[PDB]
């Protein structure tokens, strides 16, 4: 896999990939 | 965090991975 | 507002249009 | 859960707000 | 919910997620 | 082109796609 | 209409074009 | 308009719900 | 149609509209 | 990881997240 | 291919590498 | 190439059909 840069909702896209069905916790600062 | 590290610099899937369930 | 099917990644960009900095969790399997 | 609710079957905006931290 | 910070295409998601089936209109400047 | 099956929020991603600065309407009551 | 040329129904990008304004 | 004011500052769903049909 | 500002992700939406059953490849440089 | 179904833009976005600068290539006709 | 590997089918991440360049 | 033109400039939908198989 290669390095990724994402911001804003293209973040919550990658972990939703990446964790499928496991589901996962996006938890930004501030 | 993971969010802002993401966004300003670059993150693998690697350590995306730490914030499944 | 409205109610409609929200599935998967879309689902998921809903989580993050309606939580942004607070954060969410998806937790499929419950 | 969330997938009964708003997937398999239909939620509104208001109810997304209670899977926010 | 929060406050939004939207460009593009994003615009438009938001706006589906939004209005569901009453529809929108997308009306940009220019 | 071609011609595809287009649905919710693909649908108005494409209508954003196509329309751009013109606007559109994504009007599904009719 | 939209949903049913274009979900229902299958449409071409140049008939997608009859949406803009 | 709000598709610029989204982009350049900030907007809320409340006034997105304006655009609504 | 109109002219497009695409980065990221979002070329790759619109190659899919555009191709659709053709499919398309997708060749970024470096 | 995970196993998911994989369609469609969802498909292509996960190309595009997998493959990243590499390029890909989306050829549904096989 | 792609499609019956992964829309039909279930595939994995590393599956999907398949079709990097 | 198409891909950093389409960001760093603009590009038309006619330009990416070029990309299809
Ligand atoms: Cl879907
Ligand atoms: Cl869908
Ligand atoms: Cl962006
Ligand atoms: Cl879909
Ligand atoms: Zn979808
Ligand atoms: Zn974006």
Same mark, same amino acid.
């Given at each position: 896999?290669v390095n990724?840069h994402? %911001?804003?909702s293209?973040? *919550?896209?990658?972990?939703?990939? *990446? %964790?499928?069905?496991?589901?996962f916790?996006?938890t930004?600062?501030? | 965090?993971?969010?802002?590290?993401?966004?300003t610099?670059?993150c693998?899937?690697?350590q995306?991975?730490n914030?499944?369930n």
């Open positions: 896999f990724q994402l %911001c804003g293209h973040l *919550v896209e990658a972990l939703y990939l *990446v %964790c499928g069905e496991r589901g916790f996006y930004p600062k501030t | 965090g993971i969010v802002e590290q993401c966004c610099s670059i693998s899937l690697y995306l991975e914030y499944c």
